[PDB]
Design a binder for these strands. Structure first.
Lengths: 80, 69, 123, 129, 157, 82, 205
RNA sequence: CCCGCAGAAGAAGCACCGGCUAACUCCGUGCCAGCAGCCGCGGUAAUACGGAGGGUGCAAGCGUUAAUCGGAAUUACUGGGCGUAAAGCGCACGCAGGCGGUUUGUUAAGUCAGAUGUGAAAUCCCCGGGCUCAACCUGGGAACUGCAUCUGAUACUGGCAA
RNA sequence: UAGCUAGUAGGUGGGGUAACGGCUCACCUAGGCGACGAUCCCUAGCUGGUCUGAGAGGAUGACCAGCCACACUGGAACUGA
């Protein structure tokens, strides 16, 4: 297939853009305990679709903005 | 003027030791100072001035030392 | 312990300080050597040890010990300084290396002359 | 309040061997009866009963060979604060190939040697030494 | 042939109403070299009499440890009152890599292999206790087969 | 202009070379694309003095490489029939 | 940097003879042996464990005059290879040229032997070699230069060494000095008074 | 690199020697002169001070200082402690966060197995080759324990649903 | 060293760009980063690796090689692949 992430929608107080958060359960280098290492990405999407709290397939693309360089594929798990 | 220039005093006059045949250097057997030969007053008037404006050692000329047994 | 506390605040490396701040990892240092005098060591053993109060190259005025015996030191002498605790003397952390500059060699000492800088006798 | 139920299990056996109890009991679960199954084939218990319908009570019939108990010392490595996973080639040999090691691969839980002979590794759970 | 070996001898005191009287403690370790080792610790007022009294106590206190073929049988711990010796059975380590009071007890024990390291306090009395009780509990492959598994080869590997 | 040249290794008076494919602008012993074979000029009497990777040198020809002087001469010294 | 001193004084510091001054007087007797290394060597010390490791390290050193910097290299080399480091240390040390010169009997003492080797009079395997620390590789041969042959040092070495035990893993021509060296030096084929675990214990730290 | 000429001829020091640590006596000196990495020696019989003699270590170097890791499990991930030795906040409630009883189903994130690409060369390590040896140059291999992608396994941990 | 930022966070359109983009302006939206340590101060070129260590780590980044930055200090552009 192609490189695509899972993420979670965080900051949608703006237009045609979203800051997603993707969780990384990495292993600590020296202490061996798994830490919930967060990662936040300015991700471009199409016209204002979703809200907060929904897992969102997102793939790498052109640098559409200064920071936004990823594209939202689809919205999964709509909730309250 | 100080003892911090004494290493340059032996060096810059040692730099002048290579140049002139009739110009010797001695070190005081009685008072731990440098004795300088020459030709006359004017010959050693300019050599102090040769050492100052080239090698920064403001040399001060005085009468050496007597033995006095 | 309690590993996630070591995640939140890791192991502090216990860095030590070197006992000789003559200069920041340096073997020998050149000094001007003001005020040569004699002091008295502490209680378990008594004498009159010889001490110079030297201002180093990078400022940093400190003291140093004068090894051997019979030094021709004075009010101003460009000398060289190597570190070393002189334990019986409180607050003296350096040794003047004899064999260097204006602090000359020891008057004849045939044994252990690599320290005190005495040359080998001629033969 | 009872974070790790597996650490309770091995300590119940550990104190059971120290206090010389004939049989040590505890509540059952899925993983509980699986770890006791590995010790059953290895011969650290005699057998077990898993009696119960709502609060299933796993009882473990202990084992002795002399005045010294069978289980010399039994540890715990995959505790819930420092979860540890190892690969196939990096499986441990407890007491240098003498004792066993409970390790959970994806095809069930088994010993360290049975897992290494299977070619895959997983979560090293405890050290039965 | 039974390899008596003195370890450490040091003086002590009592301080009675007169002066203080000194005595001499003796630490020796004996072992024939085939898995039967034992230590002794006796004190008197004279050093040849001291190690003599410790030799009788070391001879009557031998311990069978069974030492599989020049090396130890598995890694052991031996902690005893501050002493914290660890031993890793180096397969043909070719030399007894251990310091004072670990080599000496293992030289006459019967091993030529295994390296050792004494953590914690290295007081000669408590560390010799620490190596011996560690060798007291080192189980044999025939021992664990008699109390577990029962198939000697598969329990070996 | 990727070339196939020589890079000098070894000590003083006892040289050694490994013929390497590199970008011609770069230094002699520096950044190279790929080592393909080696050459010894003081190759004392053992048969191994050169083991040239002939097929990639033939492959780099199609990619537009410029085979240097002695590198071409070593191919003429170690022929294409042996 | 060789040894260059009074010779048997090391043997009286080691008690026994390490065959360092064999020569014509093949009896040691004029040595005042084993209890006089100095003005106060007429007594005995308690001789600590560090000392008995060092004195044993000194004996294996002094038979072949190997300096410590050169000696430590062998320990780095022996532990590098396979087998036992106790066995490898002496095995690579037996391959020294003057060691095979002595074992073949071309030299009666190692100082007499190395004087032949350092003055390049030995054509081992087809090439004259003047460096005594040359490893005499297994399954080889060693010849002597004919144009410097038999100047009364070789014949006396031929006489005395044929009275001394006749070594094993090699063959001496004995007519015109054509030494052949065949196999690996075994631990059982040794002087055997030396120990080995005294050395490799000292070199761990 | 080789071949011949003359001749042992032209070439050995530096540190230490109370315990640690291999190696001792005599004389001078008297808490002085000084030694010293640590503990500590010297108050008139000093193996520790300086000078000889003797002896040990290392070697064209040998010590001194500086420097880093080791030893130091005296920052303890592997691998430490907290009643009296340094250290339980005076006690309590509680958000973030850490961890989390039991059962089934589901996902495969973590996890594990296999494959692929790459992990530049050198360096380091092993079996070899060439300078007389060696340092050194050098052949192939191993290694670079990683990382990313792809296809699977579903115990355990996590997410979701009951 | 607790808040920080104001072309600053994103849209639209013109222009710019070898090519992408606040890159650069116009107008709009009122957002973006932050306890997994933002902003600020001090120190430092990074890496393959070197040294030590049983290993894990600790210290370090000279010589050789890859990369980056600077060329008396500071700023700008030309030419040209």
């Amino acid at each position: 297939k192609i490189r695509t992430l899972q993420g979670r929608v965080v900051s949608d107080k703006m237009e045609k853009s979203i800051v997603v958060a993707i969780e990384r359960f990495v292993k600590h280098p020296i202490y061996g305990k798994f830490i919930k290492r967060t990662t936040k990405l300015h991700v471009h999407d199409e016209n204002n679709e979703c809200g907060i709290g929904d897992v969102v397939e997102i793939r790498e693309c052109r640098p559409l903005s200064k920071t936004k360089s990823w594209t939202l594929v689809r919205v999964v798990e709509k909730a309250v | 003027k100080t003892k911090a220039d004494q290493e340059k005093m032996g060096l810059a006059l040692g730099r002048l030791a290579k140049e002139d045949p009739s110009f010797r250097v001695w070190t005081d057997e009685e008072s731990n100072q440098t004795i300088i030969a020459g030709m006359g007053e004017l010959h050693l008037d300019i050599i102090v001035d040769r050492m100052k404006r080239e090698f920064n050692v403001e040399a001060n000329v005085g009468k050496p030392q007597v033995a006095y047994r | 312990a309690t590993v996630n506390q070591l995640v939140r605040k890791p192991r502090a490396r216990k860095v030590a300080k070197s006992n000789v701040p003559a200069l920041e990892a340096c073997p020998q240092k050149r000094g001007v050597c003001t005020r040569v005098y004699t002091t008295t060591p502490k209680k378990p053993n008594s004498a009159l040890r010889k001490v110079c109060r030297v201002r180093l190259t990078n400022g940093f005025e400190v003291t140093s010990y004068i090894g051997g015996e019979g030094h021709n030191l004075q009010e101003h002498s460009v000398i060289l300084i190597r570190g070393g605790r002189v334990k019986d003397l409180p607050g003296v952390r350096y040794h003047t290396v004899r064999g260097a500059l204006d602090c000359s060699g020891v008057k004849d000492r045939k044994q252990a002359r690599s320290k005190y800088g005495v040359k080998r006798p001629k033969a | 309040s009872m974070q790790d139920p597996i650490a309770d299990m091995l300590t119940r056996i550990r104190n059971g061997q120290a206090a010389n109890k004939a049989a040590v009991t505890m509540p059952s679960s899925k993983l509980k009866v699986a770890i006791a199954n590995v010790l059953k084939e290895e011969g650290f218990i005699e057998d077990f009963k898993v009696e119960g319908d709502t609060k299933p009570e796993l009882e473990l019939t202990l084992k002795y060979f002399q005045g010294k108990a069978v289980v010399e010392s039994i540890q715990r490595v995959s505790r819930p604060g420092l979860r540890i996973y190892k690969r196939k080639d990096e499986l441990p040999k407890v007491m240098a190939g003498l004792g066993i090691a409970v390790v959970s691969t994806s095809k069930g839980v088994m010993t360290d040697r049975a897992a290494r002979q299977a070619g895959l590794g997983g979560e090293i759970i405890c050290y039965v030494a | 042939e039974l390899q008596e070996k003195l370890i450490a001898v040091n003086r002590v005191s009592k301080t009675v109403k007169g002066g203080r009287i000194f005595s001499f403690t003796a630490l020796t370790v004996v072992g024939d070299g085939n898995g039967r080792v034992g230590f002794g610790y006796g004190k008197a007022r004279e050093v040849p009499a001291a190690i003599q009294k410790a030799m009788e106590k070391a001879r009557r206190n031998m311990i069978n440890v069974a030492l599989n073929n020049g090396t130890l049988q598995h890694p052991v711990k031996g902690v005893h009152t501050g002493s914290r010796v660890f031993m890793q059975p180096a397969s043909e380590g070719t030399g007894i890599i251990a310091g004072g009071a670990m080599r000496a007890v293992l030289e006459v024990a019967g091993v030529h292999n295994v390296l050792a390291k004494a953590y914690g306090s290295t007081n000669p009395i408590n560390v010799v206790r620490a190596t011996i009780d560690g060798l007291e509990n080192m189980n044999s492959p025939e021992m664990v087969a008699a109390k577990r598994g029962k198939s000697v080869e598969e329990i070996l590997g | 202009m990727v070339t196939i040249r020589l890079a000098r290794h070894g000590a003083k008076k006892r040289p050694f070379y490994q013929v390497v494919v590199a970008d011609s602008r770069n230094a002699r012993n520096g950044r190279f694309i790929e080592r393909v074979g080696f050459f010894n000029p003081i190759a004392s009497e053992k048969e191994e003095g050169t083991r040239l990777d002939l097929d990639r040198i033939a492959h780099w020809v199609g990619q537009g490489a410029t085979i240097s002087d002695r590198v071409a001469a070593l191919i003429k010294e170690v022929n294409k029939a042996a | 940097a060789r040894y260059l001193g009074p010779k048997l004084k090391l043997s009286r510091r080691e008690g026994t003879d390490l065959f360092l001054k064999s020569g014509v007087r093949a009896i040691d007797t004029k040595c005042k042996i084993e209890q006089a290394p100095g003005q106060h060597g007429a007594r005995k010390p308690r001789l600590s464990d560090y000392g008995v490791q060092l004195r044993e390290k000194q004996k294996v050193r002094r038979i072949y005059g190997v300096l410590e910097r050169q000696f430590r290299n062998y320990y780095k080399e022996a532990a590098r290879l396979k087998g036992n480091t106790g066995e490898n240390l002496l095995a690579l040390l037996e391959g020294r040229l003057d060691n095979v010169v002595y074992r073949m009997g071309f030299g009666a003492t190692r100082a007499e032997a190395r004087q032949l080797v350092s003055h390049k009079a030995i054509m081992v395997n087809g090439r004259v070699v003047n460096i005594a620390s040359y490893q005499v590789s297994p399954n080889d041969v060693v010849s002597i230069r004919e144009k410097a042959k038999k100047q009364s040092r070789v014949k006396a070495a031929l006489e005395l060494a044929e009275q001394r035990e006749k070594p094993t893993w090699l063959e001496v021509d004995a007519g015109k000095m054509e030494g052949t060296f065949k196999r690996k030096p075994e631990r059982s084929d040794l002087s055997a008074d030396i120990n080995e675990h005294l050395i490799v214990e000292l070199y761990s730290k």
